[model samples]
Target: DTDVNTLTRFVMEGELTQLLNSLCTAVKAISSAVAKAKLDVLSNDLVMNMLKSSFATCVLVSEEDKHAIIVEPEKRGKYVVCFDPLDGSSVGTIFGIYRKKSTDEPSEKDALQPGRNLVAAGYALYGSATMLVLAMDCGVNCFMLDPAIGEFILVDKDVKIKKKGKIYSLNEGYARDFDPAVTEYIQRKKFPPDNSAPYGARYVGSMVADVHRTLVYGGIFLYPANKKSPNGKLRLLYECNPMAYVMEKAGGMATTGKEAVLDVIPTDIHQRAPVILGSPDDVLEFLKVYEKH
Candidate 1:
């Protein structure tokens, strides 16, 4: 059995252990509450408290709500935390996006934007391994929690995005309401003259799952807002920007076509925005189409 101290030492130079411990705590607490909760109330409070307990964040944002709440730690740092506690979670399980803190090398403001300066950033898939993908301002890495050993073992270091993929995740129902340029691009996808005939389409209704697939294989995850919901679907602070950071960290691109998701300053806590991310060429080409618009 690996001692927690030794495990802590593994990421002592950074906040890997601290982050994971908090996440583990969060999962345990939330799981307990979820087992005895109603759908609506459980969804809100579970996600709320889970996030608040999971990190020493100054500001917490949720996808379940439209505002940021202050949960100051007794001993605080110079950072403001932002996160999407639950993605597409309807109950105790499912897929969803959860991003916080950037993995890029931290500057003085690293403490300010946990994910951006990310002393550490990762996600708990809550799947087979409760797999966690994280970075230490160095590069992206992956770990799987061995429930048997009660330890997280490093499986991959600086994981790279697979360049070959046949998957494309998005909602096709809004085809008619899409931006003309985007509509044109979708048409091209429907009938690409290129050697590739067509890519696989998937929308698992989970941001983490969808994006995780995009990271592991070659693919795109588009959440462009249509005429009905043109402001975009995913929120800027809690969803898009953080995801943009992780995708880029893992060698993928996350954009709203016209600009990089992370580069855009967020104006609201739960503001929805567009997102199209994946392999470099795929995302960049999508951007080009929008630029034409």
Candidate 2:
């Protein structure tokens, strides 16, 4: 009953399999441009086009450009889709840093998490093997493509996270350059004995890549608005909101350094704001520091 009537809306298993297969094709095609520089790649536009062409998507939304579209006005559809086609593209320039840093990495399912209640959400990393990590409300799973076979073989079914971890991600260059409160908070954590043991710095400079790391190793991810951008670098509606929802659901936590990220009501789609997320204790700890300064 579960698998037949409820687990899927498809008339047959073939339908579901076919859908995934189609997605694999789309993901592979987009992977090529993902590793390009944010300026040169046209990554967002290309990926969006590939998705609509390959899949029967109802609504398509993008975080990078802060926009959405309704496809096939007359044709009925079952789900809404949102994506960050290429994250951390800047790192692609030097030493293949983008791909190097993102290899087989997981980031609290950052891409998939925010869009957790998503009918389906995924991200492609062009670094190694052109991987795709996706979700369907059941749980997060990964599919790594084989260039030769032209198939996305299931590499991992479920991605797991450890409750406590050492890594903390943020753009601290802005902290001392801007907000004392944020700076003090980080200092308390990074200074002397108080610094969370086994903890160190990791600034992937790319959302998808950092998120992937958090997903696997367990850590904190921060993008608080400091002096440079009192607002955040990421869009609240498409990026923070969806990610917060997904992380909280996956046993991780998310916050804006003041309140939970998911709890914040968005007044605008392009609204920018701070974001701190990951392990429960570390998140709470950072929030405590924010309150002090």
Candidate 3:
């Protein structure tokens, strides 16, 4: 019922809703397939298999015989897809869709252009309910897969984030290695100087889940540059950019401690960066303290 050209045309017409609908269907299938196979733990091979399965479904909607170019690839197409097949066993999948430019072997070059070039970006969190959060030029929307109906129905429309939040999510286990400013900020937020108030700490070690909660309730989520990994551990193209697209579209903000996440042009396919994102004011407040050190 669909092909690459048709989907591309759909996107070009500013009808991303349809394209995203197709993506939701494909992602739901992946989740079901993975679950039916009873895969509780995913290895690199299994991860590739899942991503390949996703690519297979998505490519069918492509104009050509294009497939996703993972960390490695041999083909390309009209709708370029960059994804983290499986972030963690329980975290779920993250993907960013881009409009393909050339039919070359080094597909990453084309897909790595910039976040600004994304036609759409989203994450499929396979939790109690397989939820899909998507963002396009129009804004951000959320859909939940209805297994009974075998379809994804709109659950939330044009979701937006609060200017600030009461929770902060991060891994304080690395508190010693964190920047002095980061440490100070945590200390201050956890136990304020004037004894005015304190923020709650919540971290699931899952980027998708943490960010999802932040998008819904309001909060700050940070994976900042630390002593061990100076450039940060999260991938820029696959992780940060897509989330940045969603967060910004939801009236939130994303930054790399020093710059806007979407502005950081990737130099490689697996390039990594530290990400600090969440409610607009919270992010700015963190940056204010972050820059001090």
Candidate 4:
């Protein structure tokens, strides 16, 4: 019971749900302040610090020794969490939700773990509305915090993605950086060489915002490997895995061009990978085009 059983109970009945709620609250609190502050580099650092502090307050553990809690923690802190803290924070000002990189003083070492080892994974997006999505063994669920009520109400449960989506979300600015097949595909869909209409193109630059749109409207979201970032841009732990889990559970697919996202073993905490995920048919189509390279 000290090993698998312990982990299972914690994730299942676990207060992991409570942790996610706290993260939502934390993001909302910081978002309110960020909305008013001027968009400066210092503001980004401040947002990250505030978010980290907010999450820490909800967890019962000593900040001095996060590793100790991971190895041996009290019953309440049985679960371990990993996150970018604030994904796409750099573009927060433009999107109405501030995103920022983590400050250097506190390391990301404690949050570094493979997706397989995680009890749960999730992210909060502070756009027009603060959105929170989480994945567990049971299934995927989405919550929307009403600024009026200040609570995350369940809007979707056991969500499922469409098998084929008409929209495609990606940064076409990197057409030259993309594999030849991907570029060609984008071109075909952008203008449609044939008589069929062009596919819808909606890209928000922010991973959380883009993914949220895809999740709701049914589309593919891609962050492919390029010359600058050979392994791809999005982080494996905080960004990829959590979203992959949610999409797959909802009947969608996630992949690294050649392999399944969840199947790709992580070698480090901040590891990066190329990703093309969404509607099952769309992902399969992407794999077909990508594998040619």
Best by TM-score: 3
Clashes of each: 8, 11, 5, 5
> What lDDT tens digits, residue by residue, belong to model 4 across residues 70-106?
2222222333444454556523221111111234223
**lDDT, candidates in the order shown:** 0.61, 0.56, 0.72, 0.60
Worst 10 residues of 1 by lDDT: 90-99
Best candidate according to lDDT: 3
Ten residues in sequence with the least summed lDDT for candidate 3: 56-65
Candidates' TM-scores?
0.79, 0.73, 0.81, 0.74
Candidate 1 per-residue lDDT, tens place, 215-256, comes to 888778898866787778887665666667777788888777
Please estimate how well model 2 matches the true structure, expressed as its whole-model Cα lDDT. 0.56
**Segments of candidate 3 deviating more than 4 angstroms:** 1-22, 33-76, 102-106
Q: In what order do the candidates fall by TM-score, top score first?
A: 3, 1, 4, 2
What CA RMSD would you report for each candidate? 5.4, 9.3, 6.0, 8.6
The RMSD (Cα, Å) of candidate 3 is: 6.0
Q: Give the per-residue lDDT of model 3 (tens digit) for 1-293.
A: 23322222333443234445445555666677657652333322343444344433222111111343343343222455666766655566677777665655434466666787877887888877888787888899887776776666567878999998989999998887998878887887888788867999999998899999999999899998988888788888778889999999999999999898898887776778899899998899899898888
Q: Using alpha carbons, what is the TM-score of model 4?
A: 0.74
